Amino acid sequence: LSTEATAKIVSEFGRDANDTGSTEVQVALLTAQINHLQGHFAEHKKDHHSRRGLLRMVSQRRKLLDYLKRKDVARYTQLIERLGLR
RNA sequence: UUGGGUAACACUAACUGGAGGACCGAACCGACUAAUGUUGAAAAAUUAGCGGAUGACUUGUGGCUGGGGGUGAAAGGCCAA
Secondary structure, X not given: OOHHHHHHHHHOOOOOOOOOOOXXXXXXXXXXXXXXXXXXXXXXXXXXXXXXXXXXXXXXXXXXXXXXXHHOHHHHHHHHHHHOOO
């Protein structure tokens, strides 16, 4: 993931200016990495060690969403709708 | 295929679909048990009872391979009683 590719995905999801670590921002980056990693699975079926990597990643995202939906259900439906998870 | 659960793997339910030298059975094939017949209707036939059924299947016509040769899922079976 390129620098600008990361900085841009953080800005488009950033709640406000200078928003680096937020529920929607975090999950955004994780989702991205997950996508690239999942696509990395379509190929290299043998790469088992990487499978564990995404497991932790997706687990983190699952917990982040669980926290969000639990607190603000509105920000949740919005986040998912924008990304495309679930 | 749809729905649901899962990160994925894959799972569950419903629906769809319907293969299978598969099963019971028609064309049909086979033909175990008895009597009739046995100068018989018949040089192996009749009757009751009895077994099997989309395939490497069955069948018409045409054509090929021949004598100690051929042909034979072989029984020394068949090559016009």
